[PDB]
Design a protein around this ligand. Structure first.
Ligand SMILES: CC(C)(COP(=O)(O)OP(=O)(O)OC[C@H]1O[C@@H](n2cnc3c(N)ncnc32)[C@H](O)[C@@H]1OP(=O)(O)O)[C@@H](O)C(=O)NCCC(=O)NCCS
Ligand SMILES: CC(C)(COP(=O)(O)OP(=O)(O)OC[C@H]1O[C@@H](n2cnc3c(N)ncnc32)[C@H](O)[C@@H]1OP(=O)(O)O)[C@@H](O)C(=O)NCCC(=O)NCCS
Ligand SMILES: CC(C)(COP(=O)(O)OP(=O)(O)OC[C@H]1O[C@@H](n2cnc3c(N)ncnc32)[C@H](O)[C@@H]1OP(=O)(O)O)[C@@H](O)C(=O)NCCC(=O)NCCS
Ligand SMILES: CC(C)(COP(=O)(O)OP(=O)(O)OC[C@H]1O[C@@H](n2cnc3c(N)ncnc32)[C@H](O)[C@@H]1OP(=O)(O)O)[C@@H](O)C(=O)NCCC(=O)NCCS
Ligand SMILES: CC(C)(COP(=O)(O)OP(=O)(O)OC[C@H]1O[C@@H](n2cnc3c(N)ncnc32)[C@H](O)[C@@H]1OP(=O)(O)O)[C@@H](O)C(=O)NCCC(=O)NCCS
Ligand SMILES: CC(C)(COP(=O)(O)OP(=O)(O)OC[C@H]1O[C@@H](n2cnc3c(N)ncnc32)[C@H](O)[C@@H]1OP(=O)(O)O)[C@@H](O)C(=O)NCCC(=O)NCCS
Lengths: 167, 167, 167, 167, 167, 167
């Protein structure tokens, strides 16, 4: 069918320290700030893959696994793990890069769905995607099921939207 | 069993305009900024309900329904729609308050899970919750199923975490 | 004479925690940041009442009653307490919402004057205003005198402006 | 009686451009941001005069005279125009510095009251103050009356505070 | 030859405290934030001298001499120390203003090069410059040599740019 | 002599879009903001190489080659190109990643000098460094000379510091 890109072509890195202005509780990163950064680097990966402007259609999930403290170096790695017609699933891995002991613990994991757009603001078709290394293979292989679950959630979500519209 | 609070006791409002610094694309609110604000007001609702410090354990979903433009007044309403043992599901409704025509369209909808903590940082039990009005009843009545789906997602999520730990 | 709105129609809430980036002295909210937020929520209330774009014409006063510490949940309540021809007096109450003991102490109190504007930037007439509950009645009943004092201050202010223009 | 400082000893300048993040309406500075900066430079002047840490006790007034547009260079000049026992009246002049035609129009004028504090956080006595040039003389000569009016406002303010405490 | 301005005509002051959001390490100002502020006040001085919009062409150096701690009052003084055809060397002095002991230690020193631009974005000629006081004389007298060294650095820099373009 | 690290071990990437809050002139990135980000990613590279906390000792140069517009994706690549005893030269390349035509033009180039520190804040020895690929070889091979020129600049800089101390 369509043109294809490697998951490695859109793979994007971001390294960023945690500063006091990123925190809420004493020396601890606030979840909202983390979500902002996740969305930033995911948006960049989706832009590279689509070769276009994108918007966040939904945050499918953010799993906050570890507390993140002031001073911590965060490594964000985003990649496109699934391509629908005009939509992309972007998976973001966030690791704490401890330079004192070379550990790189997974601190958070997130899935977002982006939609590519043309210059007049309507959905635009995106290249397909294929893995190369084993990790890419893992996200690529587990994507279909996540996509279907997102489908069901969108059904229930639409019920809720319709209910709130009558009040 | 336990002490109970009304969903109305923890119900929190936030009104905030969209300023240029909130935008990415021309005059359009960036998704990350919206997620930061969602997490802020949800955290406040969870604090009121728990009577304690909280952290975001996970973002279960953010559904971005409408574009939000510079100048728009956003109304955030957070409430606790489900109480586990020490965890809370907070549902946030975000509406655009058009003061020129009194429309209040739902622009986004989000579910987050917070965990209450005591002063030494371990999970703390939270009061139960009950609805009063019809909307509260809706979120209260649809919560159990969302909770179970979150359970399954956490299973798959744990598989992914274990896979990434061997690479 | 003119169309009238209830003070409850424009009444606006804002809930927001104090984060480290809001502070100057150790764990203490900086006055400038508080004034920014006061102006934000007051602007929103004036927009709802006027059904129009507004600008801050003057800050009539900010009374800082209590120190506000990092972590504190602030509740801002703005309402229109007086309607001139095209101007509005907005009164903002700022309370600390202590979720550990359900106290809600008044931390600051502020009066601002907004002017409503049409799309080409000139002053626009605003609906009149009436109270319902007792608090609204209090601000409504004490407004005329504040308005007159603001009149005198504007006279002296004009003397100062004219003096500075010759130097 | 006490030690005295010249108004010129505490006189402080601040020059700062208006950037998009300072604006609300299209290319127009938001009042809250201006108030933050006013409070910043006023705090610095009060610190120099008192030789101590200070807090903002009240904003006595902000008069917004001109619209301020993106790109504008603002010149803030703060000085101490009155010294009570442990309190200071700081007057801030804000001018637009047009480098294209060397005009320096007064865009805003503000009076704030600061209280000096020692290291354990209680009010601390401040040096007295005297003018030299004509402008300083003007603010010094018009201060007593402003002080008395602030006294009356504080009386009414206390009535309002006591009324709100019973609701 | 051309019209001339005094170094005192473009001389600009900025006073600004260090707030927690300015820090990276515990209570210590982050270098990037300092560089942002340096560039801000230098840009303003270059605008006054050129009577035009400017852009930063290069940072010739920032020398960080002292640690700067939270709470510190920084005094920035920028001036034009050299005028090329359409370019300006701006020298910025940053001092810590200790109000407790009236010391004013030099905390940093920086040289930047700005280019003046007309309304369609091309380089525009700038007035020449002359000193009056001794400090101005010092920077004016040491400028030619810095200019020549910048010339050599720009040669090597161009070699590096050309090398990177082939990879 | 000492332990050695590859330039590739400390090599760090950062991808970040330009948002309106990053701009000064209409849709154009402000130099100060760019310098903040440069310092951020350079600090991270120096931390990885040193295995320690670092501070910016000096910005040796920032060369601004292209205008950077709102929406642009910036790719920052930092690496250690020279190791003194306890100091590091970090070179940062900033490229615009045009996803519409796959160009990656060098928009800026910068050299900074960091000093590694132990937990009580004094300079700490750093591993040596060696290149692998051709680009790394280029910066490694051109470093000694830059180091010597920095030595001379530090001599003149010290003259200026001593002169300013007598005024
Ligand atoms: C995202 C948006 C353009 C979707 O367009 P639409 O009008 O609904 O029309 P479509 O359904 O054809 O969109 C095309 C794709 O978006 C997907 N999509 C739309 N909403 C989605 C959601 N909530 N979750 C997952 N996918 C979604 C669709 O499934 C479709 O995918 P496909 O190409 O594989 O078929 C629209 O909902 C929107 O503008 N949302 C606001 C986005 C935003 O501004 N976010 C930041 C706000 S702060
Ligand atoms: C949230 C956290 C304290 C959970 O504690 P824990 O060590 O896993 O132990 P527990 O499982 O007993 O936590 C208690 C509750 O948290 C829930 N929980 C933990 N992780 C969860 C997740 N990813 N999604 C939903 N619920 C979760 C548990 O289900 C449990 O709920 P219950 O009271 O109904 O039984 C821990 O995972 C953590 O600290 N996460 C980081 C939180 C954070 O800092 N977020 C912002 C980072 S930027
Ligand atoms: C506010 C502004 C539009 C007033 O308009 P104007 O040219 O002075 O003409 P008017 O006097 O007829 O304004 C109409 C109303 O504004 C009121 N007004 C103007 N300045 C005022 C002041 N300093 N304090 C209180 N009210 C004021 C007038 O009293 C009048 O009220 P009314 O409808 O009850 O009669 C004008 O002064 C302005 O633009 N100020 C700058 C506002 C701003 O940009 N603030 C943020 C800057 S960072
Ligand atoms: C400012 C504060 C220390 C006043 O102290 P206090 O407990 O009221 O005791 P005092 O009245 O003796 O204060 C001493 C001086 O402050 C003045 N003061 C207090 N409140 C004032 C007000 N609202 N307006 C003007 N002056 C005020 C007093 O008049 C007095 O002046 P004087 O030396 O000339 O006699 C106290 O009200 C406070 O902490 N306010 C909060 C300040 C703050 O944190 N602002 C930023 C919050 S975001
Ligand atoms: C600054 C800029 C306009 C220079 O223009 P140009 O196309 O190179 O043409 P010119 O060489 O004639 O520029 C005129 C002057 O700029 C000087 N200049 C250009 N680059 C310079 C550099 N890297 N260092 C020092 N001076 C420089 C030139 O020496 C010249 O000085 P002169 O008037 O004394 O002869 C161009 O390089 C540019 O746009 N840079 C990006 C600026 C920017 O946006 N900075 C913030 C980015 S975040
Ligand atoms: C950086 C600092 C620790 C240097 O320490 P010091 O007291 O001068 O003692 P040293 O000279 O032995 O420092 C050790 C190394 O730093 C280098 N150094 C110090 N100042 C330097 C400068 N201005 N430029 C380049 N290198 C410098 C020294 O050359 C030395 O390098 P080496 O290991 O190859 O011999 C000290 O100057 C400082 O604290 N500066 C402020 C740093 C800062 O806070 N920046 C952000 C402020 S907003």
């Amino acid at each position: 069918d369509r043109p294809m890109k490697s998951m490695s072509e859109s793979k994007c890195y971001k390294n960023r320290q945690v500063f006091p202005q990123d925190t809420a509780h004493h020396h601890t990163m606030f979840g909202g700030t983390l979500m902002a950064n996740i969305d930033e680097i995911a948006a960049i990966t989706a832009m590279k893959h689509a070769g276009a402007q994108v918007v966040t259609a939904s945050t499918d999930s953010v799993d906050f696994l570890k507390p993140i403290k002031t001073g911590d170096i965060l490594q964000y790695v985003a990649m496109v793990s699934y391509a629908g017609t005009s939509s992309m699933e972007v998976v973001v891995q966030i690791r704490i890069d401890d330079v004192f002991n070379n550990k790189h613990d997974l601190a958070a994991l997130s899935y977002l769905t982006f939609v590519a757009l043309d210059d007049e603001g309507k959905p635009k078709h995106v290249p397909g995607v294929y893995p190369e290394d084993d990790v890419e293979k893992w996200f690529y292989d587990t994507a279909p099921q996540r996509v279907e679950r997102r489908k069901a959630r969108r059904i229930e979500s639409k019920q809720t939207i319709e209910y709130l519209a009558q009040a």
